[PDB]
Amino acid sequence: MNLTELKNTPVSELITLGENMGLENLARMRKQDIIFAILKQHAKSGEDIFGDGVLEILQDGFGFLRSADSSYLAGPDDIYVSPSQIRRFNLRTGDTISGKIRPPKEGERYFALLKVNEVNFDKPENARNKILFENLTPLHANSRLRMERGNGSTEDLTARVLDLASPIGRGQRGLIVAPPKAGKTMLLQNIAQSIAYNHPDCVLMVLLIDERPEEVTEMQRLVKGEVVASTFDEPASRHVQVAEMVIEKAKRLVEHKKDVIILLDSITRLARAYNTVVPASGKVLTGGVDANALHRPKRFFGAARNVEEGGSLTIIATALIDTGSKMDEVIYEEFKGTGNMELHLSRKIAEKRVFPAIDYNRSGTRKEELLTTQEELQKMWILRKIIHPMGEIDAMEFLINKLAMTKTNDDFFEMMKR
Amino acid sequence: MNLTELKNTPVSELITLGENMGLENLARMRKQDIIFAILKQHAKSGEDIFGDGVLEILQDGFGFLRSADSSYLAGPDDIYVSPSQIRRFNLRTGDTISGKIRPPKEGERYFALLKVNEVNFDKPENARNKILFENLTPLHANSRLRMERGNGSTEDLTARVLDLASPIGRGQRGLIVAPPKAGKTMLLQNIAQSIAYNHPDCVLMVLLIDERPEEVTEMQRLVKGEVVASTFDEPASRHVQVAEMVIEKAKRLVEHKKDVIILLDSITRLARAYNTVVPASGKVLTGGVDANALHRPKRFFGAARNVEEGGSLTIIATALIDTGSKMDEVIYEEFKGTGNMELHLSRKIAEKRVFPAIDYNRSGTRKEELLTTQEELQKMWILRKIIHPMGEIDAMEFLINKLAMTKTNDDFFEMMKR
Amino acid sequence: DTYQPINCDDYDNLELACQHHLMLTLELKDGEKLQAKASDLVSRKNVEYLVVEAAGETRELRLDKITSFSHPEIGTVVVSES
Numbered sequence A, B: 001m002n003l004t005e006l007k008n009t010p011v012s013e014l015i016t017l018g019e020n021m022g023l024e025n026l027a028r029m030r031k032q033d034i035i036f037a038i039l040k041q042h043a044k045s046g047e048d049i050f051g052d053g054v055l056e057i058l059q060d061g062f063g064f065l066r067s068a069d070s071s072y073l074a075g076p077d078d079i080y081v082s083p084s085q086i087r088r089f090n091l092r093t094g095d096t097i098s099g100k101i102r103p104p105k106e107g108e109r110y111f112a113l114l115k116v117n118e119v120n121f122d123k124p125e126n127a128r129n130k131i132l133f134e135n136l137t138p139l140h141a142n143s144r145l146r147m148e149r150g151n152g153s154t155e156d157l158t159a160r161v162l163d164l165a166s167p168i169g170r171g172q173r174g175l176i177v178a179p180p181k182a183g184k185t186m187l188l189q190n191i192a193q194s195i196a197y198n199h200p201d202c203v204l205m206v207l208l209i210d211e212r213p214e215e216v217t218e219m220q221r222l223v224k225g226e227v228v229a230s231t232f233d234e235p236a237s238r239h240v241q242v243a244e245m246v247i248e249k250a251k252r253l254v255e256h257k258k259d260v261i262i263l264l265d266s267i268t269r270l271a272r273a274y275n276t277v278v279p280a281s282g283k284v285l286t287g288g289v290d291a292n293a294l295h296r297p298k299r300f301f302g303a304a305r306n307v308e309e310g311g312s313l314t315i316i317a318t319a320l321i322d323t324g325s326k327m328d329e330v331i332y333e334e335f336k337g338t339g340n341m342e343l344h345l346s347r348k349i350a351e352k353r354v355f356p357a358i359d360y361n362r363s364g365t366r367k368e369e370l371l372t373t374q375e376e377l378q379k380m381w382i383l384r385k386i387i388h389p390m391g392e393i394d395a396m397e398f399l400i401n402k403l404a405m406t407k408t409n410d411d412f413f414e415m416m417k418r
Numbered sequence C: 001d002t003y004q005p006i007n008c009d010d011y012d013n014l015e016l017a018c019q020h021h022l023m024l025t026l027e028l029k030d031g032e033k034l035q036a037k038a039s040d041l042v043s044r045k046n047v048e049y050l051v052v053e054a055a056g057e058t059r060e061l062r063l064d065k066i067t068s069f070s071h072p073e074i075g076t077v078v079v080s081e082s
């Protein structure tokens, strides 16, 4: 059967499927163990079994096809690819390989790839001729991602405020600066819903790092896309692995002229994870942050660009401030000028239970003339003039009331203009 | 074929060349690897191969000819230079070398320079005996850089305002103090194109340290000259490596009676890069900086001088203020007035969407009488008096409107009297 | 006419044979045998080719045309076109 359909069935259904196939004692083992046991039992019949995953080449030269359902966690059900296969089709980490697999032989441990059907949702012949990501020329964002759904619901207010504060375009390198208890999690969910509704073509990937287990399940139910997370139980090496898999998978899709959007939560937790993993170089900054530990996260954050040839990579990461940890403060100081889009959340606005808690004055974008039209830009300039003198708490209250009375932003503009 | 012509070829065209030469799997690999593979294939025929680059001397006496196309990044395409070649001539870091190269032999991974043809765009023997840069006699600035085009367009007035605020000549250090979001990048682009247009003879070099990838490509396509940049993805050691290559190359051109101009953006990030990479000697100062570490950035900035024998070295650095950090102020406090020419930008004036954001009161150049004729000095002196009373914000509005209908500076001075 | 790549397991055995430079007993569906040595596996115009020599011939033939190969070391593995 299909391997990816097994990983989507609930565990209760897997046991019933396994039990009527003759397997026993499947209830007390992990889901990955159950799937591996079922596949071996079905391999007895000699039927063809399919599978797919994302390639992760190890140091020794061989790789595995991890699955996004398990958040690219190493397990018994991973598919082994010999180094010759990586040579036969020039494959790099992050390639999405789908095809037939075979049961392990004597002395083997994992299922092995048998016949490659598609690479990156394309024929292997075409997928080998795609130019590498590093050879593509970065550009400023010029195609805008509009968050406004326009249905007039109260959940659309957060999206509409986002367009007024900081427009988001394809290939943007965003950064959301948020203190604790400022509604950061609900802000990302609105963005994910707006992206999945207005722009179904763009590939949406949500990356949660060092997150509570109950927050992961909530995100998976809501987000219409791919959600990969690593909870705080897992070691720091696990956090690095998931981030590497996501960014490499995103790069491979961009090389096929596709729009990829990555929502990261958070760049602070990711940077802390790298600080633990990398060996100490002897130069340690304030707060215990290694000097060269931040090189790896900046590679992740610096990959967001608008490719001239085609496609783009959009990264919208969140940075944590006012957490009481000096390690977070120094990490944030190294990402201040990196992004071309900045959105600030304020705890003071959140303390009054008025949402979203966006600090309008301190949030903006670079080269916003390209994203918006001439008339649209002037209206935002007119509005920003009104919001500039008033305080941050009054800025949102004034802006929320005006937006509530209307349905779309253009209606808000003409009402404000008159 | 010629390496420099091969290196400027688009990657898509490079692949087609490799296919016609029998190479395969050239896609999905870096541009440097493609160049290295093609050269080896062509050298297999046995034809002569021409290559050129900027010499870099390692600590072990190794010499490599880096390329300006890749911003002097170490790679497979680099040409290896034996220490015997360095001893034969007066070869040091930054000496441009053009000559014929050979494919590597067994035990060799880099192409080797075989017959050096041109050094510093002249005969190899002439460069074997030249006066060192430090031995050259320093002198103040005598010549003046004309930053006027006369077209009277909307972009020409920005050059005029900075020209009126503080004249800049050849051979004196210059500093630009700019806050975040103050049209700093647009200011550098306007200066860079004006210099190339007015002074095609001088060698223009633009250096960008810790810059966003999308900004580098925009700068390269706009600035007519040489643009060398290192993004924030690269480690700290890369930032200092690029800086050393640029200054050493600038010195050698000066030794050959050439007036070169270096535009730096920004010295604060370059100084921060040195602090990270320079090993700690046990002395810790306020703001997490080291006095011995700071000795190198000032040497880079302090190398600008006018040579009596011939040529000059002009450096116009950029300093960042009120960025919210702590060590940034310490860097600025070390360069309060170390530069002969100083220009200030203000966030307040740029806030009203009126450009340029030049603060006339704070700007000022030392020994300005050596630059322009005495008759024009009174014209600037009376201009300062008529502009001193009103504030810096209103000063810019007065300058722009009065210069709106004026073509050149000479017309403005005559119209100012009447 | 159109080339069809062989299964991954078959390719690995052939590369293993080429790496060890051991004798190869090439077999076809017609019933002809070529007990020769294969040097290396190469590709050309998106079609991989196997160069196998008996006495210096170094003939180059398509992989999909090879039907069976046997040796005392590796298993007698037949290829599958589907």
Ligand SMILES: Nc1ncnc2c1ncn2[C@@H]1O[C@H](COP(=O)(O)OP(=O)(O)O)[C@@H](O)[C@H]1O
Residues within 6 Å of the ligand: A158, A178, A179, A180, A181, A182, A183, A184, A185, A186, A187, A355, A356
């Ligand atoms: N857009 C919003 N609309 C209404 N309430 C919100 C919104 N965003 C956040 N909140 C409220 O803020 C509280 C905490 O937000 P949370 O998602 O925990 O932020 P964080 O993840 O940064 O701690 C939630 O209980 C929620 O009710």
